[PDB]
Design a protein around this ligand. Structure first.
Ligand SMILES: Cc1cn([C@H]2C[C@H](OP(=O)(O)O)[C@@H](COP(=O)(O)O)O2)c(=O)[nH]c1=O
Ligand SMILES: [Ca+2]
Length: 135
């Protein structure tokens, strides 16, 4: 995979944000994970949703550098959101969230699953430690 620079425009929630990519604003959705919902009425504000948003927001807003890394399959979903692993100063937001128990490994669609095992080992550690979602 290859990392590419991006510029934070606006953090929306734990797993969705707007970034300037290739001189074009677009919303991105984190690959392989799912932070709780805070916008959709069908799900309501799920437990830990706000916590996940705050964690992500702090992480991306305080970064000197943001990079996006597409996987080997499709680069956008049906809603036109970019699908990537996002790094804030070299730290993967997707993993950071899972490690804290603020996200679950979800939507594993191949061939977009290069980092699946890494994220799963982190989720296991969070459950093991009974963190947030796993408390
Ligand atoms: C992470 C991801 C989400 N999605 C879709 C699945 C869900 O569609 P439906 O909305 O039709 O259920 C939605 C979940 O994202 P949200 O957590 O933003 O809702 O986005 C993909 O298509 N591919 C992906 O890799
Ligand atoms: Ca979500």
């Amino acid at each position: 995979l290859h990392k590419e620079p991006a510029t934070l425009i606006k953090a929306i929630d734990g797993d969705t944000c707007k970034l300037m990519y290739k001189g074009q604003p677009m919303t991105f959705r984190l690959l392989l994970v799912d932070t709780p919902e805070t916008k959709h009425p069908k799900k309501g504000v799920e437990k830990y949703g706000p916590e996940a948003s705050a964690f992500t927001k702090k992480m991306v807003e305080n970064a000197k550098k943001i990079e996006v890394e597409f996987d080997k399959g499709q680069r956008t979903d049906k809603y036109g959101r970019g699908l990537a692993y996002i790094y804030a100063d070299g730290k993967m937001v997707n993993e950071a969230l899972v490690r804290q128990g603020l996200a679950k490994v979800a939507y594993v669609y191949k061939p977009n699953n290069t980092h699946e095992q890494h994220l799963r080992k982190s989720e296991a550690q969070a459950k093991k430690e009974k963190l947030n979602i796993w408390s």
